[PDB]
Write a protein that binds this ligand. Structure first.
Ligand code: MG
Ligand code: MG
Ligand code: MG
Ligand code: MG
Ligand code: MG
Ligand code: MG
Ligand code: MG
Ligand code: MG
Ligand code: MG
Ligand code: MG
Ligand code: MG
Ligand code: MG
Ligand code: MG
Ligand code: MG
Ligand code: MG
Ligand code: MG
Ligand code: MG
Ligand code: MG
Ligand code: MG
Ligand code: MG
Ligand code: MG
Lengths: 109, 195, 129, 63, 153, 50
RNA sequence: AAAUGGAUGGCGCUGGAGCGUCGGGCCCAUACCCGGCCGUCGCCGGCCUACGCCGCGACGAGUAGGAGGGCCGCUGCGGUGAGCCUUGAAGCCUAGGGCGCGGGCCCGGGUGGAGCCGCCGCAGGUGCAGAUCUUGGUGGUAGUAGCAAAUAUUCAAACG
RNA sequence: AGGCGGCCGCCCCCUCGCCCGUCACGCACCGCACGUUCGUGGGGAACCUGGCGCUAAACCAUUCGUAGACGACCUGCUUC
């Protein structure tokens, strides 16, 4: 029991002022508010949990209504502690203002 | 979840910047006591700028056009409207997540109110600069509800005093309990590991 | 899982949109085929951002993965038994595809000869009885 | 771009002979092989003159 | 002949078609949208009320410049009009569909109107006489009508 | 421009939002204020213009 | 001091989100470096469609215009496929599968009923988005304007 | 812009409602993801059952003129 993943709010794509680059996303992760603090999360793996009405899940026992686009942290971003992340597929852009799980695997504890 | 913010002693643009940044991420923030939000500068200048804002109106039809709110909660809500992308369905969802109240509602009388240190008058102003009250501005121009809000505010302040005396009595009782004995075996461990 | 051709890598196409013609949405007299606009005011020719993209040489697919079906073969059209038997030497890279005007009576003989010679055919089970 | 110089991509040359004479193409094949395999600048010049046109190969006279 | 929206089964369904009949296409479409999805006796009483101007027909799509009525509040709409000629023709085709159901041997008291279709017949042309010696067309708009009536259980 | 004969304006902007009123009985927009010094009484009645 | 209400972009900003001097980080363009792929050009290899096959390197924007390639396409002619078919050709439709970067193409499914196509050469009345383009058809307008020059009709019956 | 909390007396039990020590078990599913949560999550259409109750009102039609371009608005209708 108990949550094993750290909370991180999706903030938006990597962008300029005008144009965007949808292959890289930004994460405001809670607790981290510093460039020196966003060092431990380099290499963590992220997961966007969302819902659909067709029966497609992981084969861990039971078929359900939960879909996940996987991905992982690439590097840090800015001085405020925001974190870049490249997922395996690009974001649906509905995920703005929603939470992406950051699970505590392969990093170097 | 919800972020219940006090409005006393905060500056309008600083609090609007912090609220408009924290509402785009999804944290449902509610600014309570909006009549106490201060504005730097002279109060004559602030009501002159608000009178100029009232003077801005469409001449061919004043109804179809600029809607000039006089209530201070709606003043702060227009202030955050001008900072969020409200023409898009990101700032529209952010304005749906944002709630604002003049005076204090009963659930926010119940819950605890936060205070943002970066938006404070004392933090952001040299103490010999002039300031204003948004409730004073709203009563001086349009919003005719200062007396009822002040009466209900004094009523809930009396309620808060009669709750605080009970809470402080319970805290004196629990420190008498901490003054009593047969608890120290765990307390040595807690002092050695940050009491 | 029929014939499993030789080592074919990950096939990428570098875009898969078959680029639309400008203002084909606005007028239905304009077919969806690409046609290079040669106007003096056109945003597509001037290559403004946010407009459609013109097909140029940079979208060229790899020569290793050129004309590649997703099964891993390259298609070759066939009318009859001699043009099916010409695929006898390279049957593990160049698959057969029966022409549309071939009747069912000869089509069953062609697909039986392809099953004998172990030549992949794209449409074996079409126009049967 | 990168190159500030002008772009003269193809220089001048005629590599394949434009004539469809089969015998001339066979001589082109043979003397191309000899020109790249013998280090003979005679074979180089004869291969270039076989690439050369009808007008630019003027008729020699017997005298 | 073929229709649109072929029924569940031809045993429990009758059919009717009128072709090249002098009405307005817009009036017959807007009354067919009110006929559709209704019991046959309710539709017959409704069309008699239309011919007696006691219950109207709401114009929902072809509502350009159509005056209002108080009777359209049954339909949740504001505008209405009372097509006498369209009501007479579609009542005659409802009687024809009733006779076809009687010939096919259906339980004639429990028919609902499942499908109705109205589409533009080739219109016939006459001419006006406008100013400055000009001739302008004066064209009709007849329609083809199909209807399917099905036993409701 | 410069109309050369300035006239007072026709009508009134304060009465300009003209409409068939949804009420037929003229409702009271504002009653007079109260005080504990005055005795108990009513303010408004109904009538019919004979 | 200027005429509709309005512009440091707006919101706001005073221990600055203003001014002047600056420091350390941070954000990105089709700019630069590394790498994958296409094409052009240059230099080249081989006695493996020689008009094919590889090798290395540098560069690719562009109206008017000028060239090259097109296994892009339409029509007909000579050769050519012991070509295709009434066990279904052309044509048309298609929330189907695919290829090419594109000109376009191949197959699946449905109507259709008698002609059609691949390759090498040949010859064009050979490609449409416009020209107040020509002919034909069809919408919004729209069940709208309109059926108002000259005093006027009414009851009953009959054929229906 | 109110619905959970506090007191008295009973109800069927708990003297493990907790911290430290002993013992043995529960799937040990043999390297792997979306697992654990306020969920007897929001609303709509129906299925079988207990208890307690409910028995109407709009719109059209007719009339009305205090209003009406048409809609709309104010109105009457009982068997005294
Ligand atoms: Mg220009
Ligand atoms: Mg122009
Ligand atoms: Mg370059
Ligand atoms: Mg209109
Ligand atoms: Mg009208
Ligand atoms: Mg006329
Ligand atoms: Mg009032
Ligand atoms: Mg300003
Ligand atoms: Mg500065
Ligand atoms: Mg170029
Ligand atoms: Mg062809
Ligand atoms: Mg021509
Ligand atoms: Mg000709
Ligand atoms: Mg045309
Ligand atoms: Mg043109
Ligand atoms: Mg024209
Ligand atoms: Mg027309
Ligand atoms: Mg009119
Ligand atoms: Mg009219
Ligand atoms: Mg009679
Ligand atoms: Mg008679």
């Amino acid at each position: 029991s108990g949550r094993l993943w750290s909370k991180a709010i999706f903030a938006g794509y990597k962008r300029g002022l005008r144009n965007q680059r949808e292959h890289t996303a930004l994460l405001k992760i809670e607790g981290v508010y510093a460039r020196d603090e966003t060092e431990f999360y380099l290499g963590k793996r992220c997961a966007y949990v969302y819902k659909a009405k067709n029966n497609t899940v992981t084969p861990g026992g039971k078929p359900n209504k939960t879909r996940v686009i996987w991905g992982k942290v690439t590097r840090a971003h800015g001085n405020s502690g925001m974190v870049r992340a490249k997922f395996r597929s690009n974001l649906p852009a509905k995920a703005i203002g929603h939470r992406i799980r950051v699970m505590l695997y392969p990093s170097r504890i | 979840q919800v972020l219940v913010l006090d409005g006393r002693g905060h500056l309008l643009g600083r609090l609007a910047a912090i609220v408009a940044k924290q509402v785009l991420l999804g944290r449902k923030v509610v600014v309570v006591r909006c009549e106490g939000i201060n504005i730097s500068g002279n109060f004559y200048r602030n009501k002159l700028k608000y009178l100029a804002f009232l003077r801005k109106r469409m001449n061919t039809n004043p109804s179809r056009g600029p809607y000039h709110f006089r209530a201070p909660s709606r003043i702060f809500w227009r202030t955050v409207r001008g900072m969020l992308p409200h023409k898009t369905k990101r700032g529209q969802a952010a304005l749906d997540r944002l709630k604002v109240f003049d005076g204090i509602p009963p659930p926010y009388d119940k819950k605890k109110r936060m205070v943002v240190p970066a938006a404070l008058k004392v933090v952001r102003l040299k103490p010999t600069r002039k300031f204003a009250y948004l409730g004073r501005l709203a009563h001086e121009v349009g919003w005719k509800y200062q007396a009822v809000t002040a009466t209900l505010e004094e009523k809930r302040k009396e309620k808060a005093k009669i709750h605080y005396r009970k809470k402080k009595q319970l805290m004196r009782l629990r420190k008498q309990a901490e003054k009593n004995v047969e608890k120290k075996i765990d307390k040595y461990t807690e002092v050695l590991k940050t009491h | 899982a029929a014939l499993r051709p030789l080592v074919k890598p990950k096939i990428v196409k570098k875009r898969t949109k078959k680029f639309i013609r400008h203002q084909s949405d606005r007028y239905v007299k304009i077919k969806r085929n690409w046609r290079k606009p040669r106007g003096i005011d056109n945003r597509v020719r001037r290559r403004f951002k946010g407009q459609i993209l013109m097909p140029n040489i940079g979208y060229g697919s790899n020569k290793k993965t050129k004309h590649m079906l997703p099964s891993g073969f390259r298609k070759f059209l066939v009318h009859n038994v001699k043009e099916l038997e010409v695929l006898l030497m390279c049957n593990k890279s160049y698959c057969a595809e029966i022409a549309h005007n071939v009747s069912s009576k000869n089509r069953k003989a062609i697909v039986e000869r392809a099953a004998q010679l172990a030549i992949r055919v794209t449409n074996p089970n079409a126009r049967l009885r | 771009g990168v190159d500030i110089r002008h772009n003269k991509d193809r220089k001048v040359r005629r590599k394949e002979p434009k004539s469809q004479d089969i015998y001339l193409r066979l001589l082109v094949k043979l003397y191309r092989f000899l020109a790249r395999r013998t280090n003979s600048t005679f074979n180089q010049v004869v291969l270039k003159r076989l690439f050369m046109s009808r007008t630019n190969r003027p008729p020699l006279s017997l005298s | 002949v073929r229709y649109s929206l072929d029924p569940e089964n031809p045993t429990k369904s009758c059919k009717s078609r009128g072709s090249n009949l002098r009405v307005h296409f817009k009036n017959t479409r807007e009354t067919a949208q009110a006929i559709k999805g209704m019991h046959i006796r309710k539709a017959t009483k409704y069309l008699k009320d239309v011919t007696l101007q006691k219950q109207c027909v709401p114009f929902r799509r072809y509502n350009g410049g159509v005056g209002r009525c108080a009777q359209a509040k049954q339909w949740g709409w504001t505008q209405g009009r009372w097509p006498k000629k369209s009501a007479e023709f579609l009542l005659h085709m409802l009687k024809n569909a009733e006779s076809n159901a009687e010939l096919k041997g259906l339980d004639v008291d429990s028919l609902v109107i499942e499908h109705i279709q109205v589409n533009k017949a080739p219109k016939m042309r006459r001419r006006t006489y406008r100013a400055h010696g000009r001739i302008n067309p004066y064209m009709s708009s007849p329609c083809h009508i199909e209807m399917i009536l099905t036993e409701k259980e | 421009s410069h109309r050369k004969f300035s006239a007072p304006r026709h009508g009134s902007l304060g009465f300009l939002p003209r409409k068939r009123s949804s009420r037929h009985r003229g409702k009271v927009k504002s009653f007079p204020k109260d005080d504990p010094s005055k005795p108990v009484h009513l303010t408004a009645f109904l009538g019919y213009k004979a």
